[PDB]
Write a protein that binds this ligand. Sequence first.
Ligand SMILES: [NH3+]NC(=O)CCCc1nn[nH]n1
Ligand SMILES: [Cl-]
Ligand code: NI
Ligand SMILES: [Zn+2]
Length: 330
Amino acid sequence: AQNPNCNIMIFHPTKEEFNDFDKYIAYMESQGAHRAGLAKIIPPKEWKARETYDNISEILIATPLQQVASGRAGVFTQYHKKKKAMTVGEYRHLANSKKYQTPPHQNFEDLERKYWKNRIYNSPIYGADISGSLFDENTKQWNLGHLGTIQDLLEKECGVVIEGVNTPYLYFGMWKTTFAWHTEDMDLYSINYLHLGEPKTWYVVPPEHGQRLERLARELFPGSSRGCGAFLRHKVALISPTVLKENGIPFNRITQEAGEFMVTFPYGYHAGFNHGFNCAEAINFATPRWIDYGKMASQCSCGEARVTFSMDAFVRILQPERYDLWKRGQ
Ligand SMILES: [NH3+]NC(=O)CCCc1nn[nH]n1
Ligand SMILES: [Cl-]
Ligand code: NI
Ligand SMILES: [Zn+2]
């Protein structure tokens, strides 16, 4: 059995290996990468996403979100407070201001320590889920806007055409910007490219151990749990590595730097934070191996988790017994 300890694996594909995306995902899985829930992919030296990032400042962040915490340093929720629009240039300036800039620090571990110690006492602002792409149209390899769609995967595996589209999203982050513990919608894969700026630290629970995290989460956020049987899909709960370790939860951590891809695997819970101003691009995707995860994915039907158009078809086809309840929640 490959990668039995579920370690995060790091890959260095050659330019030839970088041609066929699906083939490389399958290769990583042949090596046990999925057991971790997350893998890093360092592109070959010959590859670039686009020529420069000199011309990005006029992108609009129509609804920046201020992430306001409640709870305790290691066990907290965050709510997103809507802010007035601003451009990416304006946002970069804000991220670099004295109020929001990354403190002095010795290394990634010192900064991680500062994050967990102090995150709750600040409310960073971020740009999330902005439809768009920063890949040049002439980038043929690992262009997140040119992957096979999940609708086409489903049609190829199961035989039925469905409505829906699948496009990438941009994220503009700053110091302490946080992504809460979650799996993807319908336990899909995600791919994630860090275009520019400071790192993003990730935490991940092996898929085979995801229920352990769910059990702990229900214990640590009891009101939330009573509210919804799948409340982690609300994407608001944070649990620190110290707390996870105290509770015996299997996990791993890694830091992504500019120019690196991260793949999350079906049912791999993940969370993390940004070190400073950055821009990332992400999209969900599927493979044949996903289908059985999609059929078994939990769903939030309490109403809090988000209206999702492309999701409808996935629930309708893969989870017909749950469909009507899920839809009432939409
Ligand atoms: N699935 N990918 C993730 O959950 C991380 C997405 C990129 C991100 N960066 N800050 N919040 N989100
Ligand atoms: Cl700090
Ligand atoms: Ni995610
Ligand atoms: Zn819910």
